[PDB]
């Protein structure tokens, strides 16, 4: 079925919300200082979740579960922002809008379950270039809509993914990342690297083999060419609030 | 130049890799001949020229990895566990 059973999504939202409640509170208390109090600003946050099958339990990966737990933690932390709109995108071979910036807030468990229903981790490819093109285009039109009646609007994309893309795409992503920075869209990549998955299977130790002109294999660390300027490694959910707050504190604000 | 993610494992005593070298992205069109060269290479086992065979879930690899995926209805998103055995 293209959707999770709605009942399963409700149970997941409720379980995750309880599991992450203290972590959400810590993140929101830090976000309050970074983003509030102290202009009349507005915030638009797109949570972009990897729906590719590399994420999936059928691939013996825990990345999908950790991403949905992280989604609930972050979405719940963000709902404390008065002037914030939260939207959700799913991506693999194509990109879908799971929750629009204009849609009802995540103060409701039914709204959260409707989002979780759409993530099944079955797509056959991970097209990060298309994800970035769609995200920039989405924010550009939101910026145009903003014109209607005076807004200091700040736009943030948080990508929740195992970070496994074809090495060739690392180069193709760089022009799109420049375009995002030129348009002042901050892009943070949140790498799902669940430490309990298995002994000795972290993305930090993922290597890649290339055959040279002589035919001799040469081996490099996969992450050495990872292009994203702001990224976090999530080994345990407990890692996420402080690291995400630190990056935003420093580089969303600056 | 598509890549497939593989995890090497072995049940033979003297031929284990350090945990840090077992997970590798490899060209999708590679066959056992090329995988054996990688394993023998300086950054891996550094054993020079031992011919290795590879089992995937108890069955020997007889094609390229991409044809193995296609034959089993799998995409390039799949991680393959390759058990290496002396030929
Ligand atoms: Mg993927």
Author numbering:
A (entry chain A): 4698 to 4735, 4776 to 4886, 4890 to 4994
B (entry chain B): 12 to 98
What are the paper's exact sentences on this?
One of these energy-consuming enzymes is the conserved huge AAA+-type ATPase Rea1 (also known as Mdn1), which is composed of a hexameric AAA+-ATPase domain, followed by a long tail consisting of an α-helical linker region, a flexible aspartate/glutamate (D/E)-rich domain and a C-terminal metal-ion-dependent adhesion site (MIDAS) homologous to the inserted (I) domain within the α-subunits (αI) of integrins that mediate ligand recognition. The conserved interaction between the C-terminal Rea1-MIDAS and the Rsa4-UBL (ubiquitin-like domain) or Ytm1-UBL is essential for assembly of the 60S pre-ribosome in a reaction mediated by the Rea1 ATPase upon ATP hydrolysis that leads to the removal of Ytm1 and Rsa4 from distinct pre-60S intermediates. In this study, we report crystal structures of the Chaetomium thermophilum (Ct) Rea1-MIDAS, both alone and in complex with its pre-ribosomal substrates, the CtYtm1- or CtRsa4-UBL domains. Besides displaying the typical MIDAS fold known for integrins, the CtRea1-MIDAS crystal structures reveal evolutionary conserved Rea1 specific structural elements.
Next, we aimed to structurally investigate the complex between CtRea1-MIDAS and its two ligands, the ubiquitin-like domains (UBL) of CtRsa4 and CtYtm1. However, purification and crystallization proved to be challenging and might have been impeded by the conserved but flexible MIDAS loop (element II). Since this loop (deletion of amino acids 4734–4773 in CtRea1, or 4657–4696 in ScRea1) is dispensable for MIDAS–Rsa4 interaction, we replaced it with a short Gly-Ser-Gly linker. Using these trimmed constructs, we were able to reconstitute the complexes CtRea1-MIDAS∆loop–CtRsa4-UBL and CtRea1-MIDAS∆loop–CtYtm1-UBL, which readily crystallized, allowing us to solve their crystal structures at 1.89 and 1.84 Å, respectively. Although the overall structures of the Rea1-MIDAS ∆loop domain in complex with either Rsa4-UBL or Ytm1-UBL are highly similar to the MIDAS apo structure, the terminal helices α1 and α9 were slightly tilted (as observed upon binding of integrins to its ligands for the C-terminal helix). The Mg2+-binding site in this case is fully ordered and the metal ion is coordinated cooperatively by the MIDAS and UBL domains. However, one unforeseen major structural re-arrangement concerns the Rea1-specific element III, which in the apo structure forms a loop that crawls along helices α1 and α9 and was not fully resolved, but in the ligand-bound form becomes re-arranged, the short helix α8 partially unfolds and forms a β-hairpin that provides an additional binding site for the UBL domains of Rsa4 and Ytm1. To assess the functional relevance of the Rea1-MIDAS β-hairpin–UBL interactions, we performed genetic interaction studies with Rsa4 and Ytm1. The combination of the rea1 Y4859 > A/R I4871 > A/R constructs with mutant alleles of either Rsa4 (rsa4-1) or Ytm1 (ytm1 S78L)25,38 yielded cells, which were no longer viable.
